[PDB]
Amino acid sequence: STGSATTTPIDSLDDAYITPVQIGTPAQTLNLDFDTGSSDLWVFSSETTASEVDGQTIYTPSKSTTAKLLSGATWSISYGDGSSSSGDVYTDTVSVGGLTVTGQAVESAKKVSSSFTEDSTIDGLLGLAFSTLNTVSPTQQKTFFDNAKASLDSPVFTADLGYHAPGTYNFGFIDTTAYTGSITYTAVSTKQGFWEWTSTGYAVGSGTFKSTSIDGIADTGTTLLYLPATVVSAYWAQVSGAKSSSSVGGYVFPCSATLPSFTFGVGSARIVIPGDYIDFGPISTGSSSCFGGIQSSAGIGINIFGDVALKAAFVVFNGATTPTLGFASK
Numbered sequence: 488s489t490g491s492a493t494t495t496p497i498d499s500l501d502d503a504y505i506t507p508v509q510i511g512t513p514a515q516t517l518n519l520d521f522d523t524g525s526s527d528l529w530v531f532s533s534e535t536t537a538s539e540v541d542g543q544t545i546y547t548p549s550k551s552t553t554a555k556l557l558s559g560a561t562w563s564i565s566y567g568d569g570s571s572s573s574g575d576v577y578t579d580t581v582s583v584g585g586l587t588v589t590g591q592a593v594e595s596a597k598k599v600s601s602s603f604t605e606d607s608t609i610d611g612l613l614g615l616a617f618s619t620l621n622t623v624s625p626t627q628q629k630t631f632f633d634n635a636k637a638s639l640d641s642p643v644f645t646a647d648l649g650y651h652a653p654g655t656y657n658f659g660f661i662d663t664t665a666y667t668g669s670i671t672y673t674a675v676s677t678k679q680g681f682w683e684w685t686s687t688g689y690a691v692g693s694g695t696f697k698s699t700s701i702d703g704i705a706d707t708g709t710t711l712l713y714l715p716a717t718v719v720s721a722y723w724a725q726v727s728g729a730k731s732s733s734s735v736g737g738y739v740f741p742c743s744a745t746l747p748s749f750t751f752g753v754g755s756a757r758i759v760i761p762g763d764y765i766d767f768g769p770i771s772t773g774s775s776s777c778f779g780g781i782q783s784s785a786g787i788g789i790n791i792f793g794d795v796a797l798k799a800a801f802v803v804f805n806g807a808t809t810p811t812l813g814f815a816s817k
C-alpha cells in the first residue's frame with residue numbers, strides 16, 4: 488500500500504503545515520500537524536475542556552462506529568516550545584492520503600495549553616518520530632507510520648514541504664519526479680527516539696564551506712533552524728544590523744536587508760536554503776525589525792533541522808531495520 492497527502496502552510500510565514508487526516512467511521516477529517524519530532528497522534532475532541540477550544544475541528548468518538556476506549560490509558564506531552572496537552576485514548580481507523588490503519592491509538596485531549604487553543608488552524612498532531620517516545624501509559628502505543636509499515640510497498644515516508652506553498656507527505660514510495668539529482672542517504676541514531684543525524688558542515692552565502700560535524704534532528708514540527716551559537720553568529724554577521732535580542736528572544740535583522748543563503752552538508756552533498764526562507768517577517772505588526780529563521784540551539788540541548796531547512800529539500804525518512812535519512816535538492 489501507499490498514501491499521498493498534501494500539506495498546506497497554516498499562515499503566510501509557514502509557521503507550521505497541516506495535513507488532512509480521516510479518523511473514524513464515518514470519516515471525521517481533522518487537519519493535523521505532522522511532527523517528525525514527536526510520537527503521539529492527539530486531537531482536539533468532544534472531551535476537550537470547552538474554554539480551551541476556539542475554532543478547531545474536534546474528533547467525537549461517540550459518533551464513530553469503529554472507536555473503542557483504550558481502557559485505563561492516558562497520555563501527557565510537553566513540547567520544546569513549552570506547550571502541552573493530555574487526555575485519554577481511543578483506538579480507531581485512521582487514513583492519510585488513502586493509506587488506512589485500523590486500531591490506531593487516537594489520543595483525545597482533555598486539556599491543551601494556550602498556544603494550541605490560540606491556533607484555530609491545527610486540530611492536533613500526528614507524530615512520526617520513533618514509537619519509543621510515545622507518552623501513552625501504561626501501555627505505550629505505536630505511531631501511524633509504525634502501524635502502517637508492514638503494509639507499505641517500502642518502509643518509508645517522505646516530506647516535501649513548500650516555501651509559501653503546499654507540499655506533500657508520501658507513505659510507502661519515493662516519488663522520483665519530486666526531486667532533482669540524486670538522494671544522499673545518511674546514518675540515523677534512534678537512541679533519543681528522534682530522526683537524529685550528523686550534518687557534515689555549512690556555508691554562509693557564497694562563502695567557503697566549513698567541514699564540521701553538526702548532530703541534530705530532522706523535525707517537521709519545528710518552524711525554524713536551530714544550530715550551534717558559533718554557526719548562527721557566523722550567519723548573522725553577514726547581515727548589516729542583525730543582532731541577538733534578549734527582549735525578542737533571538738536574532739532579529741532590519742526588514743530592509745537581503746538575506747544570504749545558508750548551505751548545510753549531507754555527506755558530500757549540499758542543500759542550499761535560499762535567503763528568503765530565513766525571513767520570518769516583522770517581530771510585531773508594522774515593525775521594521777524582522778525575526779530570523781536561523782536561531783541558536785543554546786539551551787535547547789539539541790540542534791534542530793526544522794521546516795526552514797527541510798523545506799529546501801526532498802527528505803526521505805527510511806524506516807527500514809536500520810533507519811536512515813535521505814536528502815535531495817528539488
Ligand SMILES: COCCOCC(=O)Nc1cccc(F)c1
Pocket residue numbers: 524525526563564565566567616619620621622623680
Ligand atoms: C515515554 O514517555 C514519557 C513521557 O514523556 C513526556 C513527554 O513530554 N515526551 C515528549 C515530549 C516531546 C516530544 C516527544 F517525542 C516526547
